[model samples]
Target: SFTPLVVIELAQDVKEETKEWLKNRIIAKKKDGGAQLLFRPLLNKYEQETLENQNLYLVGASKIRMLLGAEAVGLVKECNDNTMRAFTYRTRQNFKGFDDNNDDFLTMAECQFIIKHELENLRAKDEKMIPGYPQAKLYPGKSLLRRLLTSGIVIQVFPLHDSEALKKLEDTWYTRFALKYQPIDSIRGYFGETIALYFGFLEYFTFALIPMAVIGLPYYLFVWEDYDKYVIFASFNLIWSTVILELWKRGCANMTYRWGTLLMKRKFEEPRPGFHGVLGINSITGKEEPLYPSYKRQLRIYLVSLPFVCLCLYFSLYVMMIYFDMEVWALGLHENSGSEWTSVLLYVPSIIYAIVIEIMNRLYRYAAEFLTSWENHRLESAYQNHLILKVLVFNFLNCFASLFYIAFVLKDMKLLRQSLATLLITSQILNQIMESFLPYWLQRKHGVRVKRKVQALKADIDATLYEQVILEKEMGTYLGTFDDYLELFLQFGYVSLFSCVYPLAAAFAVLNNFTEVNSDALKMCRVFKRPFSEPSANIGVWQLAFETMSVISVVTNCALIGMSPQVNAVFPESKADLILIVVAVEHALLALKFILAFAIPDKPRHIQMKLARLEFESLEALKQQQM
Candidate 1:
């Protein structure tokens, strides 16, 4: 009689009495008198022999007639007229698909999200501490789940995958041979808004690169020997990068409005579970909670985080210098030998350098995460922002410092072109293997072993649900989209910052992205456990990251153009004139970039009208009721 939508795992050493108490608290009724949901302990014949393994609890909410009181919560739903409105149980007939009485009424993603919210908000009424653990203290109004999680009694709380829906989605999304637009609505319905928006942006970005790829191909093929002809291509890149980002804003707005998140208000966020401070009264809520001083956080940032990031940056630069020395050594060897084998050895430096960069990035990421946690920020968003900023600055310098040195300091265009090509191709290959294939292989092997055990234990009864839950529980967890976005951010930097030097970069990126879409989809579906859905209106902070890169591209491209022999020859006999002209043109291009961004409207006209109409009607209805 239960359909499990979420799985909560407990620590291995938990006592039976404590487990019983926790289960009863979870299934206890809400204060508002709503129906309680289902919670069941899972066990199997194989698990009975092994006390080392933890217990799992299944959570379901299908027993109640009204589905989490959708009307009372003011959950938005589509009306029969194709417009979004707040739902009401009394007027359920007016909403679309209300009479179906099927499980599809609330999509699986939405149900999991609501249940997670309920679990997190399960506050303690009079309990001073958990049943068994006295160290983990809880006050009235404190979340029991948060305290247990922080105390290490609860291992993890995660959503389960719907096998049937996943199969259908995979068939339509990435398994097909024919080219078609992504099933955006279906993705949103299953994975929630944050993930769907990522796919949307991915598709949009790849399509935007098509025109650049077309323009770049002819330039690369015909103008192979003429370095002077790159002026026009560089100009197009400057304009293209600016225009596409502005257009994506409109596209993102359209998607969010269609999905009913355009008017979604921000909810009040609680403190993260890891947050710790002395007990104090909240100024706004007037409730007793842990409070840390802002000045203390600032001191941690300025004193510890600031220096550590600088030390990492210094180390990155030190490594970059070593790479340069190696490059020079390789070049000398190639020149002295002048043999077929020696010619092939020219690329060895760049390839080795790329691998080292990847390793450093991985190591530095761990340090950054640790430091950010030590700073003890109260909000998750703030912690994420600080981590991103530290990592981004260090990564940009680590990845691009060598190229910058080759181009401006050495004044060697040939070496710059060779290095860029090697770095781009090698990094893409390495990322593909590490990101998707490695995890997929590991999970596949683990799945096979678990299946064998399940088959042996199937002598008594059917264990389909048991097998599914156990297999998924052992799968690797899906970290958030930070790494994925970081990859895209660096790729965008390569294309925009140096496309004039190597016109074929865009073509390589386009081909790689086609495979990237499929591989990322496969990883999500098969390689990892299902992640809880995050409701987001747009790709947060990444839009800013991409825009920052675009702005930096304008500066780099302008410098490259000015340094070219063709432009320098034009200004011969008057060096001052060349400097003046380049500076003037750089300012003009920057101004144009700003003006274009300012001019483009974020939302389309039709969506704007719909939003206005909805607001106007609401106001008028309120006036009539009052009169």
Candidate 2:
């Protein structure tokens, strides 16, 4: 029931009978003897959206209240806490003209009665709506006003869900991102937590295009060719990336809390039934407990495993370094080669790099997973974290080592830029193909086989048996926790790390993400079985991953800027001064990141207040129980 009181304004010449009709139709009757009229006005979207008194009547309370009741109104008042009752609207009258249902405060039951009456009334009247009467759509695709004009009395449901908002958010544009992520109709709860958060990040990434473009275009057009253009571009990207990352942290916190997963801890997480641990006594409870292996033991095992991890990293980096050197050397060697076939050497380095990197990535991933599992970390979080750290270490070196080496050590800006472009474009295309297209194609192939098998079964088995088998198949097969964020994290690296040199990096990301958002949605919805619902606030370690990446962005961009031909020519007289300047600039950007993070509280003020009060209430109840 919609409990919120409705208010309306009218002209001085408005008739008493009309006013009485409006009041009776708007005021909801309580289930008990009380009025439940809620005789007060407060801030509301209704008033703000309605431009005039006539417009208020056009959309007004009776219709709005009826809608607030429809559309499977979620019983949970808020996402985090559902114990508190919020809505209390019992009934609101529409019109059966001075009858018992219309007489006093119309309860929800009476509202339904009036709506039924209106529909029947409209069918008879033949869609001719009298002015000042309620309006409604009789059928989908039928014009609301036309139906209203023909059948009078708006009885059509006011859909609470925002299709416009949804469409806007789902688009490639940035303008609708904020609207899309607004937790419409409690979607997070309806969809699984992982899917919801995945979309949230997608929305955030797309929206990032706004500021990135806003600043990027001007810098590219005018500032980029200037003597100190590098610093300007670098500083801008550094500050932008830092601020955006900080905002996302706050966004994640807000979303996680709102989506009812903020307080989730390991205690509530899925238990590891395969836990290999010793049984022990708990001194406090005098009960048997499962004592896990000590951190010391785990650390020692991991430390021993660490060299293998380093081996993987070193191997990948060394291969990449060699690939870079060979590419440069071969280009020089073939620069003067007269044979037409010598042009083939121009592509040799790329082909070798691609093949080697692909092999290296697969090998490193396999080895890292084996080593992590070999350590037998008992805590699930610890295990995940350990794997994440190892994977990230290898990934950073594999993707960025060559670029870093060329840009700084060799001072070969041209080579670094080419490599950067190739990596950015190639990775985006490849990841999309793997994450979306391949999986979709495979799912389709599997579906055809499943259908053929099902048809064979249908020839022998009863429909009931076949149905049961289908249900079991669906229930048994669950989607894996795919690493959706890894690609985005890499994309973040491209924009933040080298966006100073490559001004179009963010734009490229925006375009790629536009396709990515839809691609991911399609794959998640169609290609995969429903995953087990796990409550999560936001992207976990990935948040820290992005933060660290942004800090790296600052340092990398600044260094690249400092390495620019114009900047290098004006290089500091003292080596210490150059070092000091770089260090200071790096520190300033890092400090800015910290400030933004610190300034934006995870929860908004009102949410924080609600949480504080909830804590107080919880403590008070606990104390009473103890007493």
Candidate 3:
């Protein structure tokens, strides 16, 4: 008996002969260099006949030894002393946990991850072409799964969710009314480090906002009538933004150290399946693979990607200009009419502008993805980096362009506060709808239809597992954390940039994030399929993104302070002196931000000591072996 760890779905119209051949190839023995994975196929049934639209296969290892081989190959799991060492089957007893009888030793996430690794490593063995498709050619040592995916034969392959564990996790995580910390260790075990790290950061960020929220509440309550008394709040804003991010790095280091990913070596990156080029021998691998020239990629980046991004930025600015025109028109109508209806209509422009910004951001995201894909980046990591950079730049501009204009160019503090509030509130509502409720509604609609079909058939045999697998296969795929992180990045910008003028911004952010945690949790567990685990030590590019935003906040807050009427009164006789003072203060704050970042230790003192101990032990072991 084998546990089903991963699911593979095939297209509906695939030929029966090809299906049979594929099944045989997958389940064949290790001696024949086959996948050697246990496979069970599930077919959807109708009242009269069996449906052949899609075939679902549950994949797992038949024996513990098969999983052990994968573990050794991947070098997964940590030693008893908390060092990441390669697994050796011969010395399995020396590892952290070794049990020949316990098949549940590995976490489901790790099992699915290892199964994916094994499947991807299933290389073509002297096969010139796939059995049924003559056009789909295969070369020796080329990945079979990659070929199948690129040929559009495989619909999708994803890990199956453990419902029981998920229920337990939800109970501890977001369901409890009592205040508590997240189950980070359990989350890491179930969702892997990449996802766990996101939640960790989310929890940390939300908690970090509490102090700001508390401090801002008094400022908002007492200083509601005055905009000029904001120097203290703005200075606090700059310092708060810088300190929270610096502290998060330390928290992240602690989490990764506990999770064993802090010292984990990166695996060899494989070429992305979509990367197409002339076949050439790879110098590192000495394998014949499709190779794109770096110069050609550089040309594409400079000539196409760069220009497209610039054009998009220009379009965003053009839209911002139109928004300002609309704002002016609305203000004029409100003043001219002096009626209750006209006063209520004062916010119409900001509301419409906020909606338009959301629409534009959604449309531009698709365009960015297309351009990034067209760039044909070779490795997955490189592709992700390029895509992230493109999206981050466009999103930062698109989301914040109007606010920046109102703050600096227009120098309207009241309007800036109003615009920031409308944008933040509207975007949060729209995002919750799009991210959670909409997909859930669609999922329910599809799920009810499937249940009706199954009830009509009323098969005698136990088909619960079959129905579950089919339902999960039809569920929406969970795209990675890019969109989630993007939302947080924009929120950070809103809270940090103009919080001096509107002290309530931090409090509003804290409230939004509270619901954000639960809604995002529900979305992950219910609205989409279980995504494959991605091992990650940190939040990656987003750390740099937030840090960059903090630096910009310093300059922006200084400018806002300098523009206030109170500051202008002090330098009524000498405007240059006012400008010089603001510039000097900004420079000092920037230097202080850098100093704090450098002085704060990324890892705690104990973690640093542990790392040193691990290194020393490894060196001593090497010396003993040489002797």
Candidate 4:
């Protein structure tokens, strides 16, 4: 006997329902109209010409038809003939209220006549659609619809999935892509994601060419100091770091994204061990989906981004240097200029530059908001989350670079420069070595050791469960989540803090990344939950942060040189004057960061609108439709 189960009722929120309905309706309208997948194997010349002549109405046919194999064209013709016959009978038999419509009276010959007549009408209408255009045949012949009307063929109304043309299309398109780019082949050939990550890091350090290296060497020798001995470093450190981070975000996002026929469903079942049965059936309720992108539009955006970044940097630099301090260089001080107000005047430009950067930051962020607003998308939260993450990267680059820290080391220790350098070098280098190696080592071990276990378990699941059941039900094993990625960042930050205090920081960072590749892959496989292969996060902002950090290192060195009294450092040109120089240079460093940030973003304006930060509502509404 079957046991009785209690039925439970849950109340639904009207606001949520309303919002979902609106969102879905817009998405529905954007779907390909007259939903169909043409089983067009070896399309005859007449059929092909018919489509080409009236191609204005045929959207994806050319794309789909191109994949159909000519070898199976004969079988497809038979299928098409059968379809025509079936539709004819369906139309004739559906006259329920008509007195003589009760019998299944339409024969194959009658159906042929009926179907032939429609083709003629369709061809006539198509010609009329464009006045003065010559009439084109809509079917293989002039009157296929009429033959179908006169005598219907022996065709069934039931749907068929295994058409000859469909097989060709599937084999050509989907299978080809999966074999080429899909992260299948077990990552075994690709050496797994861990190895790929290592390669990516090595590719960047070893292979990711450094055009910026030339820029750094010049800044090191000349602009290290704003004047005779005062260091003006940190400009590139913050900016470049931000650029690295942003690049990573972009790479990760690329890794995780995928298009699908169904809108995302939070439910997915893992296959169980020792279970074999049919699970859920696929109804194919949603429309056929396209990949998130169709072309290399990003390259177009990249070309435009370069000039804007340069302009913004130059503009910010001029505003702070010319308008705020009036003095050209930091070391232009005379003797009595040293008042009790010495330190105060030294920081004036820093203050003004900070203000200007703040304004520019808002402007950059606003631009991104506007662009995202105009883009219609389904995963609104996910898309916006990516946007904000990228924006933060720009902030980091702007914030850290070009900081002139002269407080105790530069101004006070000017007399003891050589000794201080000798002492700090040994201590910092010791710490730097550990910082560089630790995170990579830890992640490597974690990735290999832990990920192997998870894969083992997944393999077990795959073996025990039927494929259909596995596809249908949700397994208890958790899908990946954001928390796992955060852990990686946390580990990275821990390593960075130690490296920050050392002179050998970058060298250490490079070494750690060398080993970091394999480790990251292991972690992704074992520890981090692997969500479906959709694009993950945007790391472009983080790259910008590192670039900013590089410049900061230079700033620190300069500040140390200028403030030491031993180096003939002066107190103040006037109370406010000295402070102004120090402050202005510091802010100028930050301004350069934003410029560097521009170089990193695929499209800064799109980044801004993708976040709700400063986009227009109308843009948001319109983009929502594309979802």
Q: For residues 1-627, could you state the per-residue lDDT of candidate 2 as single tens digits?
A: 233222122343444554453344334353321122322222223322222323222122344434344322222124223322223334222212223444233332223322332222222123333234444322221233224323423222211112243344335323323344434323353344666787788778778866786777677667555656466667766777767777777777666666445643333222132333565664455544456657855675657778777677777777876886798688888886667857677666765675566567767778877777666575577778887888787777787777777777888766666667667777777777767788788766766776665566423333342332232233223333436777787778777777776676677788787788667766644455434344566677787888899877777877776666666566646566766787888888788778877887767776577667767887898999999
- For candidate 1, the per-residue lDDT at 514 reads 89
Give each model's whole-structure lDDT: 0.82, 0.56, 0.82, 0.33
TM-score per model over all chains: 0.96, 0.66, 0.95, 0.30
Error of 4 at 261 (Å): 15
For model 2 the local lDDT of residue 487 reads 71
| C-alpha root-mean-square deviation, each candidate | 2.1, 19.8, 2.2, 23.9
lDDT of 4 at 618: 44
lDDT of 4 at 5: 11
- Report the alpha-carbon TM-score of model 3 versus the true structure: 0.95
Off by over 4 Å in 2: 1-187, 221-223, 263-273, 278-296, 299-302, 336-348, 456-482, 571-576, 620-627
- Counting clashing residue pairs in each candidate, in order, gives 0, 15, 1, 138
User: Please, what are the lDDT tens digits per residue for candidate 3 over residues 1-627?
Assistant: 567788888887688888887888888877787777788765434434445534778888855646565454555557776666656676677667768776666778877887888888888877788888987878777888888999999989988888889999888888447667888899889888888888888888999889888988988778742654555667777887888998898889988887777776788888987988888888889988888888999999999899989999999999999988988888887888777877578777888888888888889889988998998899988999999998889888888888889888988887888889888999888888988989888998998998877777656634667667878888888778889898889999888887777768888898988888888888888889998887888898888999999999888888887887867877788898888988988998899899989998888898899889878988999999999
Off by over 4 Å in 1: 32-35, 44-47, 50-54, 63-66, 69-74, 175-177, 224-231
Better of 1 and 3 by TM-score: 1
Kindly give the stretch of ten consecutive residues in candidate 2 with the minimal lDDT sum.
154-163
Cα-based lDDT at residue 281, candidate 4: 33
Q: For candidate 3, what is the total of clashing residue pairs?
A: 1
* Per-residue lDDT of model 1, residues 1-627, tens digit only: 578888998888887878877877766677632236787766545445434444778888752433644544456788899888777666777877866556667778878877887777688767787787779788877888888888888888889998998999998899347667888899899888888888888888888888888988888778742655455677678878889998898899889888777766677778876889998898989998889999999999999899999999999999999988898888888888878868578889999999999999999999999999998889888888999999999889988998899999998888888899889889989999999999899888888998887788625534777779888888888778888889888888888888776778888888888888888888889998888877777788998999999889988988887787767777779999877877787788889888988998878889888889889989999999998
Using TM-score as the measure, the top candidate is 1
Cα deviation of 181 in candidate 4 (Å)? Answer: 17
TM-score of 2: 0.66
lDDT comparing candidate 4 with the true structure: 0.33
